[PDB]
Amino acid sequence: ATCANGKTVGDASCCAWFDVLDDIQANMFHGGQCGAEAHESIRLVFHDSIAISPAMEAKGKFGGGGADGSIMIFDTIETAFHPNIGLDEVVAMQKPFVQKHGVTPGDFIAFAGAVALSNCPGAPQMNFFTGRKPATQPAPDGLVPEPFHTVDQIIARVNDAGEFDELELVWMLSAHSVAAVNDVDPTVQGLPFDSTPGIFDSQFFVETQFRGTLFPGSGGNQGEVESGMAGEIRIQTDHTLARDSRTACEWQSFVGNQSKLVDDFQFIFLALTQLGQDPNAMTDCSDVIPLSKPIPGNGPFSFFPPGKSHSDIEQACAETPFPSLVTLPGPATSVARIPPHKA
Ligand code: HEM
Ligand SMILES: *[C@@H]1O[C@H](CO)[C@@H](O)[C@H](O)[C@H]1NC(C)=O
Ligand SMILES: [Ca+2]
Ligand SMILES: [Ca+2]
Numbered sequence: 001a002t003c004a005n006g007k008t009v010g011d012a013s014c015c016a017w018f019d020v021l022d023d024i025q026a027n028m029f030h031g032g033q034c035g036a037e038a039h040e041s042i043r044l045v046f047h048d049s050i051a052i053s054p055a056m057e058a059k060g061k062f063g064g065g066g067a068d069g070s071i072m073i074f075d076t077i078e079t080a081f082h083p084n085i086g087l088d089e090v091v092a093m094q095k096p097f098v099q100k101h102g103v104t105p106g107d108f109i110a111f112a113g114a115v116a117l118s119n120c121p122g123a124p125q126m127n128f129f130t131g132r133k134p135a136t137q138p139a140p141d142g143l144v145p146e147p148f149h150t151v152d153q154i155i156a157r158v159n160d161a162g163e164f165d166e167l168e169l170v171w172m173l174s175a176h177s178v179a180a181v182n183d184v185d186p187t188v189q190g191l192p193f194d195s196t197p198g199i200f201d202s203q204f205f206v207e208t209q210f211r212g213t214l215f216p217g218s219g220g221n222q223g224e225v226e227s228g229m230a231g232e233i234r235i236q237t238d239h240t241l242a243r244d245s246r247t248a249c250e251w252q253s254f255v256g257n258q259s260k261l262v263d264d265f266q267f268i269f270l271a272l273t274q275l276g277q278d279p280n281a282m283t284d285c286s287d288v289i290p291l292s293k294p295i296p297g298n299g300p301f302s303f304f305p306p307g308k309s310h311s312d313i314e315q316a317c318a319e320t321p322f323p324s325l326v327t328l329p330g331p332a333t334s335v336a337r338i339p340p341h342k343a
Contacts, residue, residue: 007287013130014285017111020101021288024112028093032290034120034198036190036341039179040090045113046175047071047084048106049272051139055160064139066161066276067132069105072098074138083144086183086340093341106132110273114289117269120178122200122258123292124266129274131282147184147223147235151244154237162275164268170241170250171264172272177204180338181233184224188217190337191233195305197338199295202261202302205254208234208242209322210312216335228312229305231335242316249317256302256323258295300326307332 002008003015025032028041048071053063064070071078072091079088098108107130114126143161145154158164164172176193178200185191194204212226216233219226227234241247254261274282295301304310304327313322 009285009287011283011285013283014288016101016103017128017130017285017288020097020103020108020111021115021290023101024097024115028097028112029116029119032119034116034178034200036180036338037093038116038119039197039338040087040341041094041109041112041116042175042178044071044087044090044094044109045269045272046172047087047144048109049275050145050158050161051078051143052161052276053140053143056140062137062140064143064276065135065137067106067110067273068135068276069098069107069109069132070135070137070139072105072109073135077138081141081144083141083146089341089343092343103130104132104134106134113269113273117178117200118290118292120198120200121293122262122295123178124200124262124269125292126266126289127270127273127284127286128289129270129279129282130285132277145237147237149237151237151240151246154241155246162271164271166246167250168268168271170247170254171268173238173241174200174204174254174261174265175269176238177201179204180340181235182340184235185215185217185221185233188337190339191216191231192335192338193233193235193238195229195232195333195335197335200261200265201295202254202256202258203305205242205251206302206304206325207232208238209252209255209314209316210308211314212239228308229335230332231337243314244316245318249319252317252320252322256300256325258301303328305333306330 001012049067051064052066056063075091114128117123180190180192182189210228
Protein backbone atom coordinates (compact mmCIF):
# COMPACT_ATOMS: atom_id res chain seq x y z
CA ALA A 1 0.00 0.00 0.00
CA THR A 2 1.59 3.38 -0.92
CA CYS A 3 0.44 5.99 1.54
CA ALA A 4 -0.42 9.60 0.56
CA ASN A 5 3.14 10.56 1.54
CA GLY A 6 4.75 8.00 -0.87
CA LYS A 7 6.00 5.56 1.89
CA THR A 8 4.96 1.96 1.52
CA VAL A 9 3.29 -0.19 4.05
CA GLY A 10 1.79 -3.60 4.18
CA ASP A 11 -1.70 -2.57 5.26
CA ALA A 12 -3.15 0.80 4.13
CA SER A 13 -4.79 1.25 7.58
CA CYS A 14 -1.26 1.83 8.81
CA CYS A 15 -1.01 5.00 6.71
CA ALA A 16 -2.91 7.04 9.32
CA TRP A 17 -0.19 6.38 11.87
CA PHE A 18 2.25 8.53 9.83
CA ASP A 19 0.11 11.54 10.74
CA VAL A 20 0.06 10.42 14.35
CA LEU A 21 3.84 9.98 14.13
CA ASP A 22 4.39 13.49 12.83
CA ASP A 23 2.04 14.93 15.33
CA ILE A 24 3.69 13.33 18.42
CA GLN A 25 7.30 13.67 17.24
CA ALA A 26 6.76 17.42 17.05
CA ASN A 27 4.18 18.08 19.76
CA MET A 28 4.99 15.51 22.42
CA PHE A 29 8.67 14.46 21.88
CA HIS A 30 10.05 17.93 21.01
CA GLY A 31 11.44 16.92 17.65
CA GLY A 32 12.01 13.28 18.38
CA GLN A 33 14.15 13.51 21.52
CA CYS A 34 14.86 10.69 24.02
CA GLY A 35 14.06 12.86 27.01
CA ALA A 36 11.38 13.15 29.67
CA GLU A 37 8.27 12.55 27.53
CA ALA A 38 9.92 9.67 25.66
CA HIS A 39 10.81 8.15 29.05
CA GLU A 40 7.30 8.68 30.39
CA SER A 41 5.78 7.01 27.31
CA ILE A 42 8.02 3.95 27.63
CA ARG A 43 6.98 3.67 31.30
CA LEU A 44 3.29 3.95 30.40
CA VAL A 45 3.38 0.79 28.25
CA PHE A 46 4.39 -1.24 31.29
CA HIS A 47 1.77 0.19 33.61
CA ASP A 48 -0.96 -0.30 31.05
CA SER A 49 0.10 -3.79 29.98
CA ILE A 50 1.10 -5.60 33.12
CA ALA A 51 -2.29 -5.11 34.74
CA ILE A 52 -3.62 -8.47 33.73
CA SER A 53 -3.98 -11.54 35.96
CA PRO A 54 -5.14 -15.06 34.81
CA ALA A 55 -4.60 -16.05 38.46
CA MET A 56 -7.10 -13.44 39.54
CA GLU A 57 -9.48 -14.39 36.74
CA ALA A 58 -9.57 -17.84 38.25
CA LYS A 59 -10.49 -16.57 41.75
CA GLY A 60 -11.74 -12.95 42.24
CA LYS A 61 -12.31 -12.69 38.59
CA PHE A 62 -11.34 -9.46 36.67
CA GLY A 63 -7.67 -9.35 36.71
CA GLY A 64 -7.55 -6.44 34.20
CA GLY A 65 -7.17 -6.77 30.41
CA GLY A 66 -3.52 -5.96 29.81
CA ALA A 67 -2.59 -3.71 26.85
CA ASP A 68 -6.12 -2.25 26.47
CA GLY A 69 -5.60 1.49 27.14
CA SER A 70 -7.44 1.22 30.48
CA ILE A 71 -4.99 3.34 32.31
CA MET A 72 -5.91 6.20 29.96
CA ILE A 73 -9.66 5.43 29.64
CA PHE A 74 -10.05 5.10 33.41
CA ASP A 75 -7.28 7.30 34.34
CA THR A 76 -8.94 8.94 37.39
CA ILE A 77 -9.26 5.40 38.79
CA GLU A 78 -5.94 3.73 37.73
CA THR A 79 -3.33 6.52 38.09
CA ALA A 80 -4.46 6.96 41.69
CA PHE A 81 -3.05 3.50 42.43
CA HIS A 82 0.24 4.09 44.28
CA PRO A 83 2.47 2.01 41.89
CA ASN A 84 1.11 4.30 39.10
CA ILE A 85 2.27 7.49 40.86
CA GLY A 86 3.01 10.29 38.41
CA LEU A 87 1.19 8.77 35.49
CA ASP A 88 -1.86 11.13 35.72
CA GLU A 89 0.36 13.76 34.02
CA VAL A 90 1.62 11.36 31.36
CA VAL A 91 -1.92 10.25 30.52
CA ALA A 92 -3.08 13.96 30.59
CA MET A 93 -0.42 14.75 27.93
CA GLN A 94 -1.19 11.77 25.65
CA LYS A 95 -5.00 11.96 25.83
CA PRO A 96 -5.49 14.94 23.40
CA PHE A 97 -3.70 13.01 20.61
CA VAL A 98 -5.90 9.96 21.06
CA GLN A 99 -8.96 12.17 21.10
CA LYS A 100 -8.22 14.11 17.92
CA HIS A 101 -6.83 11.26 15.81
CA GLY A 102 -9.58 8.81 16.84
CA VAL A 103 -7.19 5.88 17.42
CA THR A 104 -7.83 3.49 20.40
CA PRO A 105 -6.02 4.41 23.71
CA GLY A 106 -4.28 1.02 23.76
CA ASP A 107 -2.82 1.41 20.30
CA PHE A 108 -1.69 4.94 20.95
CA ILE A 109 0.11 3.92 24.22
CA ALA A 110 1.82 1.10 22.30
CA PHE A 111 2.65 3.47 19.42
CA ALA A 112 4.07 6.21 21.61
CA GLY A 113 6.32 3.78 23.64
CA ALA A 114 7.72 2.31 20.34
CA VAL A 115 8.33 5.82 18.89
CA ALA A 116 9.85 7.07 22.14
CA LEU A 117 12.29 4.21 22.03
CA SER A 118 13.15 4.80 18.34
CA ASN A 119 14.34 8.26 19.56
CA CYS A 120 16.96 6.78 21.95
CA PRO A 121 20.36 5.81 20.33
CA GLY A 122 21.03 2.11 20.69
CA ALA A 123 17.27 1.23 20.72
CA PRO A 124 16.23 -1.99 18.98
CA GLN A 125 14.19 -1.60 15.76
CA MET A 126 10.79 -1.45 17.45
CA ASN A 127 7.61 -3.13 16.37
CA PHE A 128 4.09 -1.81 16.37
CA PHE A 129 0.92 -3.79 15.91
CA THR A 130 -2.52 -2.14 16.08
CA GLY A 131 -5.83 -3.77 17.13
CA ARG A 132 -6.39 -3.14 20.86
CA LYS A 133 -10.12 -2.43 21.55
CA PRO A 134 -10.82 0.06 24.39
CA ALA A 135 -11.01 -1.39 27.89
CA THR A 136 -14.52 -1.43 29.31
CA GLN A 137 -13.30 -1.77 32.89
CA PRO A 138 -10.37 -0.37 34.91
CA ALA A 139 -7.60 -2.73 36.12
CA PRO A 140 -7.73 -3.57 39.87
CA ASP A 141 -4.93 -2.25 41.97
CA GLY A 142 -2.19 -4.59 43.21
CA LEU A 143 -1.01 -5.59 39.73
CA VAL A 144 1.87 -3.12 39.14
CA PRO A 145 5.10 -3.80 41.16
CA GLU A 146 6.35 -1.45 43.81
CA PRO A 147 10.11 -0.53 44.16
CA PHE A 148 9.84 -2.04 47.68
CA HIS A 149 8.51 -5.44 46.64
CA THR A 150 10.61 -8.56 47.23
CA VAL A 151 12.33 -10.39 44.42
CA ASP A 152 9.94 -13.35 45.02
CA GLN A 153 6.92 -10.99 44.67
CA ILE A 154 8.02 -9.47 41.40
CA ILE A 155 8.96 -12.87 39.84
CA ALA A 156 5.47 -14.14 40.84
CA ARG A 157 3.69 -11.01 39.50
CA VAL A 158 5.38 -11.05 36.11
CA ASN A 159 4.89 -14.81 35.88
CA ASP A 160 1.22 -14.45 36.49
CA ALA A 161 0.79 -11.53 34.13
CA GLY A 162 2.23 -13.08 31.00
CA GLU A 163 4.21 -16.25 31.95
CA PHE A 164 7.42 -14.27 31.90
CA ASP A 165 10.29 -15.99 33.68
CA GLU A 166 12.84 -14.22 35.89
CA LEU A 167 15.33 -13.91 33.04
CA GLU A 168 12.68 -12.02 31.08
CA LEU A 169 12.02 -9.86 34.17
CA VAL A 170 15.67 -8.71 33.85
CA TRP A 171 15.20 -8.07 30.10
CA MET A 172 12.18 -5.78 30.41
CA LEU A 173 14.04 -3.86 33.19
CA SER A 174 16.43 -2.86 30.41
CA ALA A 175 13.95 0.06 30.05
CA HIS A 176 15.50 1.66 33.18
CA SER A 177 18.41 2.45 30.86
CA VAL A 178 16.39 5.43 29.50
CA ALA A 179 14.61 6.49 32.65
CA ALA A 180 14.49 8.84 35.61
CA VAL A 181 12.47 8.97 38.87
CA ASN A 182 10.36 11.88 39.76
CA ASP A 183 8.50 10.65 42.76
CA VAL A 184 10.51 8.49 45.02
CA ASP A 185 12.70 11.18 46.44
CA PRO A 186 10.37 14.01 47.52
CA THR A 187 13.18 16.60 47.32
CA VAL A 188 14.25 16.23 43.64
CA GLN A 189 12.77 14.97 40.39
CA GLY A 190 14.41 13.46 37.37
CA LEU A 191 17.15 11.41 39.05
CA PRO A 192 18.27 8.88 36.37
CA PHE A 193 18.57 5.17 36.80
CA ASP A 194 21.88 5.28 34.90
CA SER A 195 24.55 7.69 33.66
CA THR A 196 23.16 7.64 30.10
CA PRO A 197 19.28 8.14 30.22
CA GLY A 198 18.93 9.19 26.55
CA ILE A 199 21.01 6.14 25.39
CA PHE A 200 19.67 2.59 25.33
CA ASP A 201 22.80 0.74 26.45
CA SER A 202 23.89 -1.55 29.39
CA GLN A 203 25.08 1.17 31.81
CA PHE A 204 21.98 0.47 33.91
CA PHE A 205 23.31 -3.08 34.42
CA VAL A 206 26.94 -1.96 35.07
CA GLU A 207 25.99 0.72 37.58
CA THR A 208 23.45 -1.03 39.78
CA GLN A 209 26.27 -3.55 40.38
CA PHE A 210 28.47 -0.98 42.22
CA ARG A 211 28.45 -1.00 46.01
CA GLY A 212 26.03 1.66 47.28
CA THR A 213 27.90 4.59 48.75
CA LEU A 214 25.58 7.66 48.75
CA PHE A 215 21.99 8.84 48.39
CA PRO A 216 21.76 11.28 45.39
CA GLY A 217 19.27 13.54 47.16
CA SER A 218 17.57 12.76 50.52
CA GLY A 219 17.82 9.40 52.23
CA GLY A 220 14.98 7.57 54.12
CA ASN A 221 12.62 7.23 51.11
CA GLN A 222 10.59 4.12 50.70
CA GLY A 223 11.90 1.97 47.83
CA GLU A 224 15.30 3.74 47.46
CA VAL A 225 18.75 2.42 48.51
CA GLU A 226 22.19 3.97 48.04
CA SER A 227 23.70 4.13 44.56
CA GLY A 228 27.45 4.20 43.91
CA MET A 229 27.18 7.45 41.78
CA ALA A 230 26.30 11.07 42.42
CA GLY A 231 22.99 12.16 40.87
CA GLU A 232 21.99 8.56 40.17
CA ILE A 233 19.07 6.95 42.02
CA ARG A 234 18.90 3.17 42.79
CA ILE A 235 15.61 1.56 43.81
CA GLN A 236 15.61 -1.51 46.04
CA THR A 237 14.08 -3.95 43.54
CA ASP A 238 16.77 -3.15 41.01
CA HIS A 239 19.43 -3.36 43.70
CA THR A 240 18.39 -6.83 44.82
CA LEU A 241 17.63 -8.23 41.30
CA ALA A 242 21.28 -7.35 40.55
CA ARG A 243 22.46 -9.43 43.48
CA ASP A 244 19.92 -12.19 43.79
CA SER A 245 21.19 -15.68 42.78
CA ARG A 246 18.32 -16.15 40.33
CA THR A 247 18.90 -13.03 38.31
CA ALA A 248 22.48 -11.98 39.08
CA CYS A 249 24.15 -13.76 36.15
CA GLU A 250 21.44 -12.61 33.73
CA TRP A 251 21.83 -9.01 35.06
CA GLN A 252 25.53 -9.18 34.39
CA SER A 253 25.17 -10.86 30.92
CA PHE A 254 24.13 -7.54 29.40
CA VAL A 255 27.37 -5.78 30.40
CA GLY A 256 29.40 -5.36 27.22
CA ASN A 257 26.78 -7.26 25.16
CA GLN A 258 24.72 -4.90 23.06
CA SER A 259 23.29 -7.47 20.66
CA LYS A 260 21.83 -9.49 23.56
CA LEU A 261 20.41 -6.34 25.13
CA VAL A 262 18.76 -5.24 21.92
CA ASP A 263 17.45 -8.56 20.64
CA ASP A 264 16.10 -9.50 24.07
CA PHE A 265 14.40 -6.10 24.66
CA GLN A 266 12.89 -5.97 21.09
CA PHE A 267 11.27 -9.24 21.92
CA ILE A 268 10.12 -8.51 25.44
CA PHE A 269 8.75 -5.05 24.66
CA LEU A 270 6.54 -6.44 21.83
CA ALA A 271 5.32 -9.14 24.26
CA LEU A 272 4.25 -6.47 26.88
CA THR A 273 2.45 -4.61 24.12
CA GLN A 274 0.38 -7.73 23.28
CA LEU A 275 -0.69 -8.75 26.81
CA GLY A 276 -4.43 -9.45 26.79
CA GLN A 277 -4.47 -9.47 22.97
CA ASP A 278 -4.34 -12.11 20.30
CA PRO A 279 -1.28 -11.35 18.05
CA ASN A 280 -2.91 -13.12 15.18
CA ALA A 281 -5.82 -10.68 15.22
CA MET A 282 -3.49 -7.59 15.12
CA THR A 283 -2.23 -5.59 12.18
CA ASP A 284 1.43 -5.11 11.73
CA CYS A 285 2.31 -1.43 11.27
CA SER A 286 6.01 -1.77 12.25
CA ASP A 287 6.75 -0.11 8.88
CA VAL A 288 5.64 3.22 10.32
CA ILE A 289 8.11 3.22 13.22
CA PRO A 290 11.26 5.15 12.24
CA LEU A 291 14.69 3.52 12.15
CA SER A 292 16.64 3.56 15.43
CA LYS A 293 19.94 5.33 15.46
CA PRO A 294 23.25 3.75 16.46
CA ILE A 295 24.99 4.86 19.64
CA PRO A 296 27.04 7.64 18.10
CA GLY A 297 30.76 7.78 19.18
CA ASN A 298 33.56 5.22 18.89
CA GLY A 299 33.60 4.25 22.53
CA PRO A 300 33.41 0.91 24.35
CA PHE A 301 29.69 -0.09 24.54
CA SER A 302 30.03 -0.54 28.38
CA PHE A 303 32.49 1.12 30.69
CA PHE A 304 33.02 2.13 34.25
CA PRO A 305 32.10 5.81 34.70
CA PRO A 306 35.00 8.14 35.92
CA GLY A 307 36.16 7.28 39.39
CA LYS A 308 34.74 3.71 39.39
CA SER A 309 36.70 0.53 38.72
CA HIS A 310 36.31 -3.20 39.07
CA SER A 311 36.99 -2.93 42.87
CA ASP A 312 33.61 -1.17 43.23
CA ILE A 313 31.72 -4.08 41.70
CA GLU A 314 29.84 -6.34 44.04
CA GLN A 315 30.37 -9.62 42.23
CA ALA A 316 27.03 -11.46 42.51
CA CYS A 317 27.13 -13.86 39.48
CA ALA A 318 29.18 -16.76 40.90
CA GLU A 319 29.74 -18.49 37.58
CA THR A 320 31.14 -15.69 35.47
CA PRO A 321 33.51 -12.95 36.69
CA PHE A 322 32.35 -9.42 36.03
CA PRO A 323 33.99 -8.28 32.74
CA SER A 324 37.00 -6.10 32.60
CA LEU A 325 35.78 -2.72 31.43
CA VAL A 326 37.77 0.44 30.92
CA THR A 327 37.29 3.26 33.37
CA LEU A 328 36.58 6.48 31.56
CA PRO A 329 39.02 9.30 32.30
CA GLY A 330 38.57 11.95 34.92
CA PRO A 331 37.41 12.34 38.58
CA ALA A 332 34.03 11.01 39.67
CA THR A 333 31.03 12.90 38.18
CA SER A 334 27.40 13.67 39.10
CA VAL A 335 24.81 12.32 36.60
CA ALA A 336 22.53 15.23 35.52
CA ARG A 337 18.81 15.33 36.24
CA ILE A 338 16.20 15.19 33.44
CA PRO A 339 13.40 17.56 34.52
CA PRO A 340 9.91 15.96 34.06
CA HIS A 341 7.44 17.29 31.54
CA LYS A 342 5.45 20.53 32.05
CA ALA A 343 1.77 19.55 32.94
C1 HEM B 1 9.67 -4.87 38.79
C2 HEM B 1 9.07 -3.81 38.02
C3 HEM B 1 9.46 -2.46 38.08
C4 HEM B 1 9.56 -1.61 39.14
C5 HEM B 1 9.44 -1.96 40.63
C6 HEM B 1 9.81 -0.29 38.59
C7 HEM B 1 9.83 0.86 39.33
C8 HEM B 1 10.03 2.13 38.80
C9 HEM B 1 9.99 3.34 39.60
C10 HEM B 1 9.76 3.44 41.12
C11 HEM B 1 10.13 4.36 38.73
C12 HEM B 1 9.90 5.85 39.05
C13 HEM B 1 8.43 6.22 39.16
C14 HEM B 1 8.20 7.64 39.65
O1 HEM B 1 9.05 8.22 40.34
O2 HEM B 1 7.16 8.19 39.31
C15 HEM B 1 10.33 3.79 37.42
C16 HEM B 1 10.48 4.53 36.27
C17 HEM B 1 10.50 4.00 34.99
N1 HEM B 1 10.33 2.67 34.69
FE1 HEM B 1 10.16 1.17 35.93
N2 HEM B 1 9.93 -0.33 37.22
C18 HEM B 1 9.72 -1.66 36.91
C19 HEM B 1 9.58 -2.13 35.63
C20 HEM B 1 9.64 -1.39 34.47
C21 HEM B 1 9.52 -1.93 33.15
C22 HEM B 1 9.36 -3.42 32.80
C23 HEM B 1 9.53 -0.90 32.27
C24 HEM B 1 8.97 -0.82 30.99
C25 HEM B 1 9.39 -1.50 29.82
C26 HEM B 1 9.83 0.25 33.08
C27 HEM B 1 10.12 1.49 32.56
C28 HEM B 1 10.37 2.63 33.32
C29 HEM B 1 10.71 3.92 32.75
C30 HEM B 1 11.05 4.20 31.29
C31 HEM B 1 10.74 4.76 33.81
C32 HEM B 1 11.08 6.23 33.79
C33 HEM B 1 9.89 7.12 33.64
C34 HEM B 1 10.27 8.59 33.55
O3 HEM B 1 11.42 8.94 33.33
O4 HEM B 1 9.38 9.41 33.69
N3 HEM B 1 9.86 -0.05 34.43
N4 HEM B 1 10.22 2.42 37.46
C1 LIG C 1 26.05 -11.99 24.04
O1 LIG C 1 24.98 -12.83 24.40
C2 LIG C 1 24.75 -13.89 23.47
C3 LIG C 1 23.47 -14.61 23.91
O2 LIG C 1 23.62 -15.16 25.21
C4 LIG C 1 26.03 -14.78 23.38
O3 LIG C 1 25.89 -15.83 22.43
C5 LIG C 1 27.22 -13.88 22.96
O4 LIG C 1 28.43 -14.61 22.91
C6 LIG C 1 27.35 -12.74 23.92
N1 LIG C 1 28.29 -11.78 23.38
C7 LIG C 1 29.40 -11.46 24.03
C8 LIG C 1 30.20 -10.35 23.37
O5 LIG C 1 29.77 -12.06 25.04
CA1 LIG D 1 -4.38 -1.95 31.09
CA1 LIG E 1 21.33 4.22 29.42
